[PDB]
């Protein structure tokens, strides 16, 4: 937890819980066993995990909500402090300069000076037509800052995954095992040929409003696709392979690490590249980093 220069407004439990669903205490099977999963992701093993009851946001935190936080606190995000953030190449306007540097493994990501949550494609862009889209260009530090100010916290990975699974046992996606059941789109991911052309068959070639598509069985929206969502846990591909109370009862993840867990996949994910919009999928990013496809939702103790 970093240092914060704001204070926390007094709020009633009903105000905090608005927009949240109450997940009952219980067990669930976390993890996955897809043979094509990338070993370095540590999706396995599948294990029974017991969680205490918690609340979780039905929606990722929106631009309008993050703007309220910034209005109240003057909070300055990491992307503003560093002066740049990651934007998908095809979304940068031609007259907007970018840094000449490349992400070796993912050259479709460009570092854009001046890209941040209120200007998500760089200077000249805005969020005036996206108030109910998930806030992006928020680092893990920014996410924990908002959640703290909001009277909440980030979910653990296990809380995130229990809620995202929506009461189904070991299904592939939040809603079941078929990606487009009866040909209906259920999430905002990539269609077409990644990274060359997104056909937008699901309606969106960038972020969608936080209430797009149907909820899962617990009432959560866009747990799969739309934006990656920061979780509290440090990233490890093996800590959770241990079988102990620490890893199976309200697991908090490893005590140390270098990157924090992100869940759920994004509008950029595709079967032919990452296949990371399955509910067991997982990756990470370093806590000071920010990108146009990464946001968060909050959780809270009851």
């Amino acid at each position: 937890m970093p240092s914060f220069d704001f204070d926390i407004p007094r709020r009633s439990p009903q105000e905090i819980a608005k927009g949240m669903v109450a997940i009952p205490g219980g067990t669930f099977r976390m993890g996955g066993e897809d043979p094509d999963a990338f070993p370095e992701d540590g999706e396995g093993p599948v294990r029974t995990v017991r969680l205490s009851p918690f609340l979780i946001d039905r929606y990722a935190v929106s631009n309008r909500q993050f703007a309220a936080f910034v209005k109240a606190t003057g909070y300055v995000t990491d992307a503003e402090r560093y002066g740049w953030s990651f934007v998908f190449h095809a979304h940068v306007a031609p007259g907007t300069p970018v840094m000449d540097a490349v992400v070796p493994e993912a050259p479709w990501w460009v570092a854009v000076p001046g890209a941040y949550w209120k200007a998500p494609e760089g200077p000249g862009s805005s969020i005036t037509d996206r108030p109910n889209h998930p806030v992006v260009h928020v680092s893990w530090n920014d996410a924990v800052a908002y959640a703290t100010w909001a009277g909440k916290r980030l979910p653990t990975e296990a809380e995130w995954e229990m809620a995202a699974r929506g009461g189904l046992d070991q299904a592939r996606y939040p809603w079941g095992n078929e990606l487009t059941p009866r040909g209906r789109h259920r999430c905002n991911i990539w269609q077409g040929t990644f990274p060359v052309h997104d056909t937008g068959e699901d309606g969106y070639t960038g972020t969608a409003p936080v209430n797009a598509f149907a909820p899962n069985g617990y009432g959560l929206y866009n747990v799969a696709g739309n934006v990656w969502e920061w979780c509290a846990d440090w990233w490890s591909a093996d800590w959770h392979a241990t079988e102990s109370p620490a890893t199976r009862i309200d697991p908090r993840g490893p005590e140390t690490g270098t990157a924090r867990v992100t869940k759920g996949g994004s509008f950029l994910c595709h079967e032919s590249y990452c296949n990371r919009y399955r509910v067991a999928a997982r990756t990470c990013n370093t806590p000071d980093s920010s990108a146009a496809h990464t946001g968060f939702r909050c959780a809270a103790d009851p």
């Binding site: 990338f38 370095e40 992701d41 560093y82 990651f86 840094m99 540097a101 490349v102 992400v103 070796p104 493994e105 993912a106 990501w109 570092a111 990656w228 990157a259 992100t262 996949g265 994004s266 950029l268 994910c269 590249y273 990452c274 990371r276 990756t283 990470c284 990013n285 370093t286 000071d288 980093s289 990108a291 990464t294």
Partner: peptide, 14 residues
């Protein structure tokens, strides 16, 4: 060829 990258980090560019 290597594990796909979905989360671009500042370190990838530094």
């Amino acid at each position: 060829a290597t594990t796909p990258l979905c989360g671009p980090s500042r370190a990838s560019i530094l």
